[PDB]
């Protein structure tokens, strides 16, 4: 039997290849093609700002944080042009409610990231990875860390669980009208999304490239693997939350939490 966890996803990709493509009638054609890469390329290029090595850095640009927020905001357009390209009021309203809770729960990550970039004081990722040299920026900011966790898992990572189905009748999940390679493109996109959120979390919250007794790149890789397993553990443990309860625990509870979080970090940093 197959011994590797990734080989199942590999076979899934093989399966999506060589499948006949049908044209949709009474549909727009340019967005039907362009909507997959708005979901894929965003979290693909979210990987372009990680300091995997000082000598093998993929991009030595001055700002990486703002690019990450730009991808966070950009992701919504994939659910919107997918909703309009569904060309069925059912599916369109399903994607409208999915984009609703998406825009609703994407607010928190930037304000949660303000704490770590304020105690770091720079946008160049070399400064952040050199800041976590002895003390990581997770001990004081527990609330900011969990708020960024909720926000990162809330951006189309399936934790809300309103993507392929709809609690509300008169509408339907928006993953139905795509059946060619685009559905595999969606899955591989969320896969690079979860691994890139984990990598950004480890290299921005915890200390990357430390190397206590072993070479630091495999130290980063193993820590990323532990956070991968913990993310999968809590994603599976996380039950489906209906639309209402998600709206209830959104703007009410965590906007004050992040505002007092910014107050606490600004009071303690000086």
């Amino acid at each position: 039997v197959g011994w590797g966890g990734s080989l199942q996803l590999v076979a899934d990709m093989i399966k999506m290849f060589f499948k006949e493509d049908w044209i949709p009638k009474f549909s727009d054609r340019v967005i039907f093609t362009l909507a997959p890469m708005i979901a894929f390329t965003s979290l693909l290029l979210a990987f372009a700002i990680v300091p995997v090595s000082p000598g093998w850095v993929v991009a030595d640009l001055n700002i990486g944080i703002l690019f990450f927020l730009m991808m966070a905001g950009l992701a919504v357009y994939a659910v919107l042009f997918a909703g309009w390209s569904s060309n069925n009021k059912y599916s369109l309203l399903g994607a409208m409610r999915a984009s609703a809770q998406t825009l609703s729960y994407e607010v928190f990550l930037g304000l949660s990231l303000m704490g770590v970039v304020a105690q770091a004081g720079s946008f160049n990722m070399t400064d952040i990875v050199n800041s976590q040299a002895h003390v990581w920026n997770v001990i004081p900011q527990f609330f900011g860390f969990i708020t960024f966790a909720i926000a990162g898992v809330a951006v189309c990572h399936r934790h809300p669980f309103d993507q392929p189905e709809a609690e509300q009748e008169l509408a339907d999940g928006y993953h139905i009208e795509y059946s060619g390679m685009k559905f595999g493109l969606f899955f591989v996109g969320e896969y690079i999304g979860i691994v890139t959120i984990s990598a950004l979390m480890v290299t921005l919250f915890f200390g990357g490239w430390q190397g206590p007794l072993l070479p630091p790149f495999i130290w980063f890789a193993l820590k990323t693997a532990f956070f991968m397993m913990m993310f999968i553990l809590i994603r599976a443990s996380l039950p489906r939350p209906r639309y209402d309860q998600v709206m209830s625990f959104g703007w009410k509870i965590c906007l004050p939490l992040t505002l007092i979080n910014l107050l606490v970090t600004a009071a303690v940093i000086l």
Partner: protein, 164 residues
């Protein structure tokens, strides 16, 4: 630098021409997003590092999303197509096109009169706008927050909800 600036400026020009020539709205929204991305590329090429990435997060990531919401919810595609193309003929496009072209040639003649004094792509970091925003310019920020409260209340008012 020169070839990149020329090609992204021409991309912006072509996207601006495309958004003002088509009829279907969603194509126009896509081409306007392309134009905004080109403008952010111009901002990064000039050296305004805190502008190209600031435009996308807010100007091309929330407000245009609101435009997409309203054009999606009206469901105006599939209805009222023929008469808009009937009325918007090239002949009535020429009318104000030359009137705006007089303005264009006047501002080109005004701007070509000065010397060049060319500036390189100087990089401006966020460390100094964090001071200049907080130097003389604090009351601008405070009154802008009050401005945003004003926008919130006038949008709540004139977008009043009801039973329907």
């Amino acid at each position: 630098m020169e070839f990149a600036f020329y090609i992204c400026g021409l991309i912006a020009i072509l996207a601006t021409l495309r958004v003002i020539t088509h009829t279907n709205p969603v194509h126009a929204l896509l081409y306007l997003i392309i134009s905004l991305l080109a403008i952010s590329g111009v901002f990064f090429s000039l050296g305004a590092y805190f502008a190209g990435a600031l435009e996308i997060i807010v100007y091309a990531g929330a407000i245009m999303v609101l435009f997409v919401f309203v054009v999606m919810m009206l469901n105006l595609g599939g209805s009222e197509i023929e008469q808009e193309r009937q009325w918007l003929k090239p002949q009535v496009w020429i009318g104000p096109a030359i009137l705006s072209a007089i303005m264009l040639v006047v501002i080109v003649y005004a701007i070509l009169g000065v010397n060049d004094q060319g500036i390189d792509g100087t990089p401006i970091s966020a460390k100094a706008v964090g001071i200049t925003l907080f130097g003389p310019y604090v009351l601008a920020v405070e009154l802008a927050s009050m401005l945003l409260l004003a926008g919130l209340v006038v949008a709540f008012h004139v977008g009043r909800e009801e039973r329907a």
